[PDB]
Amino acid sequence: GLPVCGETCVGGTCNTPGCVCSWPVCTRN
C-alpha cells in the first residue's frame, strides 16, 4: 500500500514479487 518501489508505471508495469503496478509508481503493501 506504500510506494516502496522505485519503479514506475506508465509505459510498462510491475510484476515485481510483492510490488504491484500502480500509477504513477509501483506500490508494495
Overview of the molecule:
It is classed as immunosuppressant. This protein has 29 residues and is largely without helices or strands. The chain has one domain (1-29). The protein is globular and about 20 Å long.
Question: Could you say which overall geometry the principal axes of the C-alpha atoms support?
Answer: globular
Instruction: State the oligomer.
Output: monomer
Largest sheet: none
Number of domains: 1
First and last CA, distance: 4 Å
Overall structural class, as computed from helix and strand content, comes to: little secondary structure
PDB class: immunosuppressant
Keywords: cyclic peptide, T-cell proliferation, cytotoxic
Assembly: monomeric
Entry title: Solution structure of the cyclotide pase A
Key features?
T-cell proliferation, 0% strand, immunosuppressant, Rubiaceae, 29 residues, little secondary structure, hemolytic, cytotoxic
Sum this structure up briefly.
It is classed as immunosuppressant. By secondary structure, the protein is low in regular secondary structure.
Layout of helices and strands, plus pairs?
Elements: no helix or strand
